[PDB]
């Protein structure tokens, strides 16, 4: 049966299921770094499940079929548009930032659920606690507004105040000129239009706020490009991190039960991502909301519950 209070009183215990290697590891870095490769290698060598960066359409990947939905029905934002015209008058920048924050929150909830119900560790290519660096970079470049920043802070507080911090934070530090060189070599025009200050602001936010903040919670590993390219030493350093001053040692079976009940309910996870704060960037009118909702319900496997979609090939509906 599904996990619940009856299962808890029956005897399913998170501490019993944990195998001393159930660790949450988040690899962070600036734009166009080797953090993805480092996360892949750490997840492979340590046997942990890898969760790539929570971009747009991650919720599409985790629901229905794996195929991503239309941009109009999932996100209503464009990273390419943000790169081309950051100071748009339609709120694209903050729409994208809020949608990406919600996606990262959902991915963190999924990773925590996997760790608590399986005992296997998770390696995230980015987390909730490192998402604000893009918001700070956007605000300091004038791309978004102070009201947008305040709304993001409110949502971040009321949402992330409920989840446990990562066990390990591995940050890959790369100087801005090397970042721009890698961007130039990659050849994608949209990110080739990225200015130098925007890349500098992300680095300033990472070094001055994120790393000092996460250092108090637990140990933080900082690597350069050359060190990160060799993942054997990274894995060896992770393995010999016996210190743990976070809340994970303090957690008990009841607290883990509450956390699992929270993370397995996705609507309860995303409850405060839609709070009635009518910013022009994110507010959607009644008519557009109704039309888009009608289209989403008109999608193939979305009109009814997952077990009750006839057009996708579900049978025995009359006895289900």
């Amino acid at each position: 049966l599904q996990y619940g209070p009856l299962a808890f009183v029956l005897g399913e215990r998170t501490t019993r299921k944990l195998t001393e290697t159930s660790k949450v590891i988040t690899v962070d870095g600036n734009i166009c770094s080797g953090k993805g490769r480092l996360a892949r290698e750490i997840a492979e060598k340590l046997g942990l499940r890898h969760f790539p960066e929570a971009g747009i359409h991650y919720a599409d990947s985790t629901t229905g079929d794996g195929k991503p939905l239309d941009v109009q029905l999932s996100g209503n934002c464009s990273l390419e548009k943000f790169y081309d015209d950051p100071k748009s008058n339609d709120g694209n920048s903050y729409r994208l930032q809020s949608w990406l924050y919600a996606s990262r929150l959902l991915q963190y909830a999924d990773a925590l659920e996997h760790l608590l119900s399986t005992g296997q560790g998770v390696v995230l290519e980015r987390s909730i606690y490192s998402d604000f660096v893009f918001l700070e970079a956007m605000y300091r470049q004038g791309f978004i507004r102070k009201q947008c920043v305040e709304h993001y802070n409110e949502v971040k507080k009321v949402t992330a105040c409920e989840y446990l911090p990562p066990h390990v934070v591995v940050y890959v530090d790369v100087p801005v000129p090397e970042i721009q060189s890698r961007i130039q070599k990659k050849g994608n025009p949209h990110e080739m239009k990225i200015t130098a200050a925007y890349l500098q602001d992300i680095e300033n936010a990472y070094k001055k706020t994120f790393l000092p903040e996460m250092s108090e919670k637990c140990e933080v590993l900082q690597y350069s490009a050359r060190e990160a390219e060799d993942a054997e030493k990274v894995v060896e350093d992770i393995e010999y991190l016996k210190c743990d001053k976070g809340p994970w040692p303090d957690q008990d079976d009841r607290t883990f039960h509450r956390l699992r009940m929270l993370v397995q309910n996705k609507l309860e996870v995303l409850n405060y991502t839609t709070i009635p704060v009518y910013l022009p960037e994110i507010t959607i009118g009644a008519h557009q909301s109704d039309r888009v909702f009608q289209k989403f319900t008109e999608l193939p496997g979305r009109k009814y519950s997952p077990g009750y979609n006839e057009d996708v090939g579900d049978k025995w509906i009359w006895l289900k």
Partner: protein, 347 residues
């Protein structure tokens, strides 16, 4: 809180209420009230926060004062009669003390403030349990001792409850405070009909409990605690908003819905006793309750308020937890008017 501890506290609350409803001794009735309060306080304080702590403190203070007054009434009745059996009390002063204590427990005006305060303080499940059970028990005691209730005092408190509930619900925007003021008004109706037909009191209690359960389950389903939070539910699951609109129409007493039956039967019974001004005033005052029900219905169902952008992800995901008996509560709170003559079975 551990699930075993939570379920044993709930069972202790229900055990206290059952002890009150089955006891024939005033001391055992008082014991049941004390046990109910003692096991109820942690239920209110389950989700720890300053608001929950303050609500629990206020509720405990009010219930402790009411229990002290009730025990004093019991002792005074013992002094003048030497009897412990719960029957028509033998002293008017003891009866007045008992009536005031039970009114304070029920939240009747002018002892009402704690009802909206605690209801706003506590969560939706706690508010549901509070309203339902903590109105169930003292009304049982009042029905037992109805034959000695002072009609003037009881009707004064009932009319005050109706007026105050209507006005408070008219002003409020928070859903829990609206529900609390609706509870105050319905308690006023039930206690008004109490000194004439305890069967009608029980009928109104059953209908009110059904409607309140349906409304609170719908609010839990929508995960909305304010008006604007409820205004986004049409974009995620419009069925819930439509069912809630029908339930709100029922709660206002609009025919041919279930909510009209208690008012109709109470008006008939009170008119049988050559009372016309009181039923007319009680019927006219309910228009305030209907007005703020309709104002809530405009925001949620009959119109379409602006939405946000992450509602798309909310669309993509599905409601996992199920509240069983919610369809039954929705049906029974809207479509049981033709089955009215079952009140004889209730008799």
């Amino acid at each position: 809180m551990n699930p075993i501890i939570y379920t044993t506290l709930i069972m202790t609350v229900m055990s206290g209420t059952m002890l009150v409803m089955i006891s024939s001794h005033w001391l055992l009735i008082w014991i049941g009230f004390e046990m109910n309060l003692l096991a109820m306080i942690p239920v209110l304080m389950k989700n720890f926060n300053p608001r929950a702590t303050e609500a629990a403190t206020k509720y405990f203070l009010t219930q402790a004062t009411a229990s002290m007054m009730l025990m004093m009434a019991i002792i005074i009745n013992l002094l003048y009669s030497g009897q412990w059996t719960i029957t028509k009390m033998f002293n008017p002063v003891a009866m007045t003390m008992m009536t005031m204590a039970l009114a304070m427990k029920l939240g009747l005006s002018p002892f009402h403030f704690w009802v909206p305060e605690v209801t706003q303080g506590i969560s939706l499940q706690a508010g549901l349990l509070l309203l339902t059970w903590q109105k169930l028990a003292p009304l049982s005691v009042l029905c037992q001792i109805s034959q000695s209730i002072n009609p003037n005092l009881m009707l004064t408190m009932a009319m005050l409850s109706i007026l105050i509930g209507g006005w408070g619900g008219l002003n409020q925007t928070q859903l829990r405070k609206i529900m609390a003021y609706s509870s105050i008004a319905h308690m006023g109706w039930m206690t008004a009909v109490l000194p004439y037909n305890t069967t009608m009191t029980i009928l109104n209690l059953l209908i009110y409990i059904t409607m309140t359960l349906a409304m609170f389950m719908l609010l839990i389903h929508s995960s909305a605690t304010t008006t604007l939070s409820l205004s986004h539910t049409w974009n995620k699951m419009p069925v819930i908003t439509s069912l809630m609109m029908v339930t709100l129409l029922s709660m206002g007493g609009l025919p041919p819905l279930s909510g009209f039956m208690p008012k109709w039967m109470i008006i008939q019974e009170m008119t049988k006793n050559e009372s016309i001004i009181m039923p007319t005033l009680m019927a006219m005052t309910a228009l305030l309750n209907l007005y703020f029900y309709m104002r809530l219905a405009y925001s949620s169902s009959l119109t379409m308020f602006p939405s946000t952008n992450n509602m798309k992800m909310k669309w993509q995901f599905e409601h996992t937890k199920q509240m069983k008996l919610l369809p039954t509560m929705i049906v029974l709170s809207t479509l049981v008017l033709p089955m009215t003559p079952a009140l004889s079975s209730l008799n």
